[PDB]
Design an enzyme around this catalytic site. Structure first.
Site, PDB file in Angstrom:
ATOM      1  N   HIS A 132      14.270   7.914  74.959  1.00  0.00           N
ATOM      2  CA  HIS A 132      14.815   9.021  75.729  1.00  0.00           C
ATOM      3  C   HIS A 132      13.832  10.195  75.906  1.00  0.00           C
ATOM      4  O   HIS A 132      14.166  11.215  76.496  1.00  0.00           O
ATOM      5  CB  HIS A 132      16.172   9.422  75.128  1.00  0.00           C
ATOM      6  CG  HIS A 132      17.235   8.377  75.328  1.00  0.00           C
ATOM      7  ND1 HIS A 132      17.334   7.248  74.541  1.00  0.00           N
ATOM      8  CD2 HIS A 132      18.221   8.269  76.254  1.00  0.00           C
ATOM      9  CE1 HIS A 132      18.342   6.503  74.958  1.00  0.00           C
ATOM     10  NE2 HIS A 132      18.897   7.100  75.997  1.00  0.00           N
ATOM     11  N   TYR A 172      -5.091   3.530  68.372  1.00  0.00           N
ATOM     12  CA  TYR A 172      -5.312   2.143  68.002  1.00  0.00           C
ATOM     13  C   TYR A 172      -6.690   1.946  67.388  1.00  0.00           C
ATOM     14  O   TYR A 172      -6.832   1.123  66.501  1.00  0.00           O
ATOM     15  CB  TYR A 172      -5.127   1.166  69.177  1.00  0.00           C
ATOM     16  CG  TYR A 172      -3.686   0.756  69.362  1.00  0.00           C
ATOM     17  CD1 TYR A 172      -3.160  -0.338  68.687  1.00  0.00           C
ATOM     18  CD2 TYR A 172      -2.864   1.457  70.193  1.00  0.00           C
ATOM     19  CE1 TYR A 172      -1.843  -0.715  68.836  1.00  0.00           C
ATOM     20  CE2 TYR A 172      -1.536   1.111  70.332  1.00  0.00           C
ATOM     21  CZ  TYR A 172      -1.037   0.025  69.667  1.00  0.00           C
ATOM     22  OH  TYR A 172       0.282  -0.340  69.796  1.00  0.00           O
ATOM     23  N   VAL A 229       5.249  -0.398  63.167  1.00  0.00           N
ATOM     24  CA  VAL A 229       5.707   0.524  64.207  1.00  0.00           C
ATOM     25  C   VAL A 229       4.976   0.280  65.529  1.00  0.00           C
ATOM     26  O   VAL A 229       5.591   0.258  66.599  1.00  0.00           O
ATOM     27  CB  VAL A 229       5.642   1.987  63.751  1.00  0.00           C
ATOM     28  CG1 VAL A 229       5.901   2.927  64.901  1.00  0.00           C
ATOM     29  CG2 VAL A 229       6.691   2.238  62.659  1.00  0.00           C
ATOM     30  N   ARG A 230       3.674   0.066  65.471  1.00  0.00           N
ATOM     31  CA  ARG A 230       2.914  -0.218  66.683  1.00  0.00           C
ATOM     32  C   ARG A 230       2.976  -1.687  67.135  1.00  0.00           C
ATOM     33  O   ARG A 230       3.471  -1.980  68.226  1.00  0.00           O
ATOM     34  CB  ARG A 230       1.457   0.252  66.567  1.00  0.00           C
ATOM     35  CG  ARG A 230       1.299   1.754  66.675  1.00  0.00           C
ATOM     36  CD  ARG A 230       1.964   2.448  67.841  1.00  0.00           C
ATOM     37  NE  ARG A 230       1.912   1.697  69.087  1.00  0.00           N
ATOM     38  CZ  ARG A 230       2.523   2.086  70.198  1.00  0.00           C
ATOM     39  NH1 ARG A 230       3.181   3.235  70.250  1.00  0.00           N
ATOM     40  NH2 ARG A 230       2.487   1.315  71.283  1.00  0.00           N
ATOM     41  N   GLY A 244       6.379  -3.385  67.843  1.00  0.00           N
ATOM     42  CA  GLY A 244       6.901  -2.774  69.050  1.00  0.00           C
ATOM     43  C   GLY A 244       6.219  -3.337  70.279  1.00  0.00           C
ATOM     44  O   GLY A 244       6.871  -3.618  71.290  1.00  0.00           O
ATOM     45  N   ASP A 245       4.906  -3.478  70.234  1.00  0.00           N
ATOM     46  CA  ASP A 245       4.168  -3.999  71.370  1.00  0.00           C
ATOM     47  C   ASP A 245       4.583  -5.437  71.688  1.00  0.00           C
ATOM     48  O   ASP A 245       4.690  -5.821  72.853  1.00  0.00           O
ATOM     49  CB  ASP A 245       2.663  -4.022  71.086  1.00  0.00           C
ATOM     50  CG  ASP A 245       2.082  -2.653  70.809  1.00  0.00           C
ATOM     51  OD1 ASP A 245       1.044  -2.651  70.103  1.00  0.00           O
ATOM     52  OD2 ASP A 245       2.566  -1.616  71.273  1.00  0.00           O
ATOM     53  N   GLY A 274       6.910  -4.607  74.527  1.00  0.00           N
ATOM     54  CA  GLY A 274       5.784  -4.338  75.403  1.00  0.00           C
ATOM     55  C   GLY A 274       5.917  -4.978  76.764  1.00  0.00           C
ATOM     56  O   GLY A 274       5.484  -4.397  77.752  1.00  0.00           O
TER      57      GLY A 274
HETATM   58  C1  HEM Z   1       7.411   5.658  70.431  1.00  0.00           C
HETATM   59  C2  HEM Z   1       7.272   4.546  71.184  1.00  0.00           C
HETATM   60  C3  HEM Z   1       7.883   3.220  70.725  1.00  0.00           C
HETATM   61  C4  HEM Z   1       7.664   2.697  69.524  1.00  0.00           C
HETATM   62  C5  HEM Z   1       6.821   3.169  68.330  1.00  0.00           C
HETATM   63  C6  HEM Z   1       8.373   1.438  69.442  1.00  0.00           C
HETATM   64  C7  HEM Z   1       8.471   0.587  68.410  1.00  0.00           C
HETATM   65  C8  HEM Z   1       9.193  -0.571  68.367  1.00  0.00           C
HETATM   66  C9  HEM Z   1       9.421  -1.548  67.283  1.00  0.00           C
HETATM   67  C10 HEM Z   1       8.767  -1.250  65.963  1.00  0.00           C
HETATM   68  C11 HEM Z   1      10.190  -2.586  67.618  1.00  0.00           C
HETATM   69  C12 HEM Z   1      10.599  -3.746  66.709  1.00  0.00           C
HETATM   70  C13 HEM Z   1      11.977  -3.466  66.139  1.00  0.00           C
HETATM   71  C14 HEM Z   1      12.292  -4.545  65.168  1.00  0.00           C
HETATM   72  O1  HEM Z   1      12.590  -5.639  65.656  1.00  0.00           O
HETATM   73  O2  HEM Z   1      12.229  -4.329  63.918  1.00  0.00           O
HETATM   74  C15 HEM Z   1      10.452  -2.250  68.972  1.00  0.00           C
HETATM   75  C16 HEM Z   1      11.277  -3.169  69.700  1.00  0.00           C
HETATM   76  C17 HEM Z   1      11.590  -2.911  70.994  1.00  0.00           C
HETATM   77  N1  HEM Z   1      11.277  -1.855  71.855  1.00  0.00           N
HETATM   78 FE1  HEM Z   1      10.194  -0.260  71.257  1.00  0.00          FE
HETATM   79  N2  HEM Z   1       9.018   1.288  70.654  1.00  0.00           N
HETATM   80  C18 HEM Z   1       8.767   2.283  71.432  1.00  0.00           C
HETATM   81  C19 HEM Z   1       9.166   2.562  72.720  1.00  0.00           C
HETATM   82  C20 HEM Z   1       9.934   1.690  73.443  1.00  0.00           C
HETATM   83  C21 HEM Z   1      10.358   2.005  74.804  1.00  0.00           C
HETATM   84  C22 HEM Z   1      10.042   3.265  75.479  1.00  0.00           C
HETATM   85  C23 HEM Z   1      11.045   0.964  75.171  1.00  0.00           C
HETATM   86  C24 HEM Z   1      11.632   1.033  76.570  1.00  0.00           C
HETATM   87  C25 HEM Z   1      11.339  -0.017  77.264  1.00  0.00           C
HETATM   88  C26 HEM Z   1      11.067   0.003  74.149  1.00  0.00           C
HETATM   89  C27 HEM Z   1      11.697  -1.168  74.195  1.00  0.00           C
HETATM   90  C28 HEM Z   1      11.859  -2.021  73.140  1.00  0.00           C
HETATM   91  C29 HEM Z   1      12.623  -3.241  73.069  1.00  0.00           C
HETATM   92  C30 HEM Z   1      13.454  -3.786  74.267  1.00  0.00           C
HETATM   93  C31 HEM Z   1      12.513  -3.878  71.729  1.00  0.00           C
HETATM   94  C32 HEM Z   1      13.255  -5.198  71.442  1.00  0.00           C
HETATM   95  C33 HEM Z   1      14.517  -4.796  70.816  1.00  0.00           C
HETATM   96  C34 HEM Z   1      15.090  -3.535  70.556  1.00  0.00           C
HETATM   97  O3  HEM Z   1      15.604  -3.252  71.610  1.00  0.00           O
HETATM   98  O4  HEM Z   1      15.234  -2.676  69.689  1.00  0.00           O
HETATM   99  N3  HEM Z   1      10.351   0.543  73.090  1.00  0.00           N
HETATM  100  N4  HEM Z   1       9.920  -1.110  69.452  1.00  0.00           N
END
Ligand code: HEM
Length: 207
Positions: A19, A47, A125-126, A129-130, A134
């Site tokens: 958000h 990175y 966290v990086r 998430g990627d 990603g």
């Molecule tokens: C500060 C920036 C962000 C960070 C550090 C981050 C980090 C992470 C991490 C660590 C996961 C793995 C969660 C787990 O399975 O334990 C994750 C999953 C995911 N992220 Fe992000 N994320 C970020 C931004 C975003 C944004 C902006 C989106 C919008 C598209 C996004 C979409 C998703 C999706 C769809 C997953 C798969 C499942 C879930 O929805 O929670 N992320 N992210």
């Protein structure tokens, strides 16, 4: 399991990241490739630092199987930036935002202290998430702004075939790490801090 506790303890921070005005506007098509490139420039900075810490911790013998070098993003990001900016002139123009200075400084502390638990928090966290979300980001950059997939190498993870399997195995490695209560608490706190640093990167990009 650690993988579940990590996700649960940072879920609210992740919502907050989604958000963020800058990232929200970017993903909704309200900004442009320029802003995407500014993001990727800041990412190259953090990175680069993260990968130095990963290298140090891997060498120490902690979490080795987790710290897959195939995940390294800095070199791929540099190639993306050469494409996005048209030349390699960005290297001398870019400056770390205040957010990135704090993030990099922390990463350098983790590197020099060879703090395995803190590094793993940052890695999760990086990179998870990627790997996990990603593709959504990459898709939006292609859809809204017409970014060439060849300039989205950061999101591709060359060397990984079955991504779902890789993610499941990554989580199993987290769950199998040997950690004391102190180390686990430290790792959890650090993951929270990692989200905080990443949110501020977005906040500064918006300014
Ligand atoms: C500060 C920036 C962000 C960070 C550090 C981050 C980090 C992470 C991490 C660590 C996961 C793995 C969660 C787990 O399975 O334990 C994750 C999953 C995911 N992220 Fe992000 N994320 C970020 C931004 C975003 C944004 C902006 C989106 C919008 C598209 C996004 C979409 C998703 C999706 C769809 C997953 C798969 C499942 C879930 O929805 O929670 N992320 N992210």
């Amino acid at each position: 399991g650690l993988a579940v506790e990590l996700k649960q303890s940072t879920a609210q921070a992740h919502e907050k990241a989604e958000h963020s005005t800058f990232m929200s506007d970017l993903l909704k098509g309200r900004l442009g490739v320029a802003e995407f490139t500014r993001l990727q420039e800041q990412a190259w900075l953090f990175y680069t630092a993260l990968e130095q810490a990963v290298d140090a911790v891997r060498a120490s013998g902690f979490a080795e199987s987790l710290l897959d070098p195939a995940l390294n993003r800095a070199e791929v990001l540099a190639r993306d930036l050469d494409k996005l900016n048209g030349s390699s002139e960005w290297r001398s123009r870019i400056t770390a935002s205040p957010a990135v200075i704090d993030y990099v400084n922390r990463l350098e502390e983790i590197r020099d202290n060879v703090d395995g638990p803190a590094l793993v928090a940052h890695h999760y966290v990086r990179y998870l998430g990627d790997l996990s979300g990603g593709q959504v980001i990459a898709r939006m950059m292609q859809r809204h702004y017409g970014v060439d997939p060849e300039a989205l190498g950061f999101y591709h993870f060359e060397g990984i075939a079955k991504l779902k399997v890789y993610k499941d195995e990554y989580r199993e490695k987290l769950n199998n790490l040997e950690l004391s209560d102190e180390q686990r608490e430290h790792l959890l706190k650090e993951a929270t801090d990692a989200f905080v640093f990443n949110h501020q990167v977005f906040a500064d990009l918006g300014k």
